[PDB]
Design a protein around this ligand. Structure first.
Ligand SMILES: Cc1ncc(COP(=O)(O)O)c(/C=N/CCCCCN)c1O
Ligand SMILES: Cc1ncc(COP(=O)(O)O)c(/C=N/CCCCCN)c1O
Lengths: 364, 370
């Protein structure tokens, strides 16, 4: 269901800006940050720009006291253009060209990630400017083994590169908190091993993103989700500083998509609605994020008919919902997507030269 | 994108390296000679079929001008495509607009440029053309998954167009992209033959046009039928039509795909679980987005091609584990900065690229326009 008031907002917004739209609610950006902040106390929260690098999200979060997690030069430029102080940032891409390192340092970001010795060697030129987080895994793509992590920290001593601590990411939309618990335990044992091996003790644990949000099925409330995480962290020496890199949790619930029916046809028993947004645009996450969004219509009346929701492109792969029960809709009627904030517009293409959903900032 | 109006084999290795020198990496090298060669190969394979290049696969202004000078026509699907051809001086009578489902604005934008051939495949769409009955002529698109009406439904659309005073130019179909079996076209042509006759026997206006769509195949990693042999049973089928009927086709991939060569460079590398992982500056959110949207597989090589061959992984630049372009590819040892080369990289590649992570898109370098 959508409230009468949510319906009014969506409808007003379409009058003024047209369709397709992404309604960004700054109050939910705030609501989500504070909830995570409350759920994970004494963890510094570095918003990952990646899922939604919108300048209004950045301004809204900066004003809340949030920090920031950067992966590229584009993202550095973004934070900089919004006057985010570089001491509030970390750079988390584990594989960087010399220029990527330079671009971030020039701005003032001096925390970086390594998970291999080839990348550690890139830092010999910059050893007086940086402190590194070593990313572990214990999915195939990034992170070194606990054992390799030691090799790297050791070599970083010989080379005089400062190691700030360890990081990991257990995966996006992690619905089981125990994964974090297991990872935190491991990182503790590695941190122990570093110390009585003669090496400089590690000051930081960066526990990543992956905190989950509600899509078509409901997930555990954040307080309950982070409870065993907090208990795991309490075993670390309270001289170890903890960060996180939330993306999805903050941005996902703050965006509602609005698409309109361009046209329609009966095909093999079903009504096909062809929307002005789809898999090459805001629903790109159906392809890249294996996503499934709650979909709704303003129109609720009459019988529900087996339906197909198709995207604007001529492509067959451009189908949003293969089989969905919907009221009979007219050309121009609206289709609403919830939890449309993360890995949606970010992963949009320009295929067919269809225009991208325009993002509207509300309660700014 | 930018053009060079100026300046694997010995020669290809040289141009690749000097482009990387001049422009950086990743790059897409567009050869307008191959754009011409493919246009001409297809033109020869289908005598007397008017080829309307589908912009969708590679909506590149250089490709458009190159093709306009060759005598090609154009297949448009959107206002952005309309704007592209209009800015390159394409006359509006060389174009058709083949998107079956259109907002009123999509009709008016095409009409303002002067494109007056559109596609319909249902009566809801037909009805959007009442305001334009003096201006348009329509192709009725048949299917034999997402678009196209049945042969029976098409007759309804054609009878109703009459009652409403809307001209039907003809019939169209698209059998699917990368069709490897020409008999799909053949069967579709035979059916359109029948539908066109039924229209005459019902005493409706005779259809003037058959549009056989695109889908002509190219070589990726598996050899396809040479275009001449592929098109032979198609020509046979078309020769059974009244010599009155104008035949159109909407080639995209066949013309653009072989014309582009991708160049990526190794940003970094690690041995992970018995394989060397190379992280490239292009991947599935970039030029290799076809691996994802086009179910694609491209020939890949290296300029190195040298000594001991090691089981490797080619990963894109993004921190996403989905972004891997090849697993367990046997490559020689590469240093960072070394080049990984993709072939047949022209269609449904850069056109479906994203700005994810704000990673910079490959720059397209246009060679040999004039
Ligand atoms: C180093 C690092 N830090 C933070 C994030 C944000 O994770 P989320 O909180 O958005 O799940 C990510 C995101 N990782 C993968 C997202 C893949 C999207 C689905 N295709 C990351 O790689
Ligand atoms: C009405 C119409 N006409 C022509 C084309 C061009 O087909 P191709 O020759 O590029 O296979 C198309 C292209 N369809 C693209 C679908 C496959 C691309 C990968 N998902 C089309 O929709």
């Amino acid at each position: 269901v959508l409230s009468a008031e949510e319906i009014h907002l969506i409808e007003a917004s379409v009058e003024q800006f047209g369709a397709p739209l992404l309604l960004l609610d700054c109050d939910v950006i705030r609501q989500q940050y504070r909830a995570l902040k409350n759920a994970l106390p004494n963890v510094t929260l570095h918003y990952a720009l990646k899922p939604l690098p919108h300048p209004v999200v950045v301004r809204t979060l900066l004003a809340e006291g949030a920090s920031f997690d950067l992966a590229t030069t584009g993202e550095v430029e973004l934070v900089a253009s919004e006057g985010v102080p570089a001491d509030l940032t970390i750079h988390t891409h584990p594989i960087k060209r010399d220029a990527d390192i330079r671009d971030a340092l020039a701005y003032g970001c001096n925390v970086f990630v390594v998970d291999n010795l080839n990348e550690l060697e890139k830092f010999k030129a910059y050893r007086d400017d940086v402190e590194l987080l070593v990313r572990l895994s214990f999915s195939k793509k990034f992170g070194c083994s606990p054992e390799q992590a030691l090799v790297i920290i050791e070599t970083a001593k010989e080379w005089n590169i400062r190691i700030k601590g360890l990081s990991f990411h257990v995966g996006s939309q992690t619905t089981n908190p125990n994964k974090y618990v297991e990872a935190i335990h491991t990182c503790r044992h590695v941190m122990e091993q570093v110390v009585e091996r003669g090496l400089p003790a590690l000051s930081t644990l960066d526990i990543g993103g992956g905190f989950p949000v509600n899509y078509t099925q409901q997930v555990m409330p954040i307080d309950q989700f982070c409870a065993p995480i907090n208990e795991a962290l309490s075993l670390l020496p309270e001289t170890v500083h903890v960060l996180a890199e939330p993306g999805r949790f903050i941005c996902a619930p703050a965006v509602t998509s609005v698409a309109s029916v361009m046209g329609q046809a009966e095909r093999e028993g079903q009504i096909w609605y062809y929307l002005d947004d789809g898999i090459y645009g805001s629903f790109s996450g159906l392809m890249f994020d294996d996503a499934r969004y709650p979909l709704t219509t303003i129109k609720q009346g009459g019988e529900l008919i087996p339906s197909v929701l198709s995207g604007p492109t001529c492509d067959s792969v451009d189908v949003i919902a293969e089989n969905i029960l919907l009221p009979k809709l007219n050309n121009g009627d609206l289709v609403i997507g919830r939890t449309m904030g993360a890995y949606t517009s970010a992963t949009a293409t320009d295929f067919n030269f269809f225009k991208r959903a325009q993002t509207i900032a509300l309660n700014e």
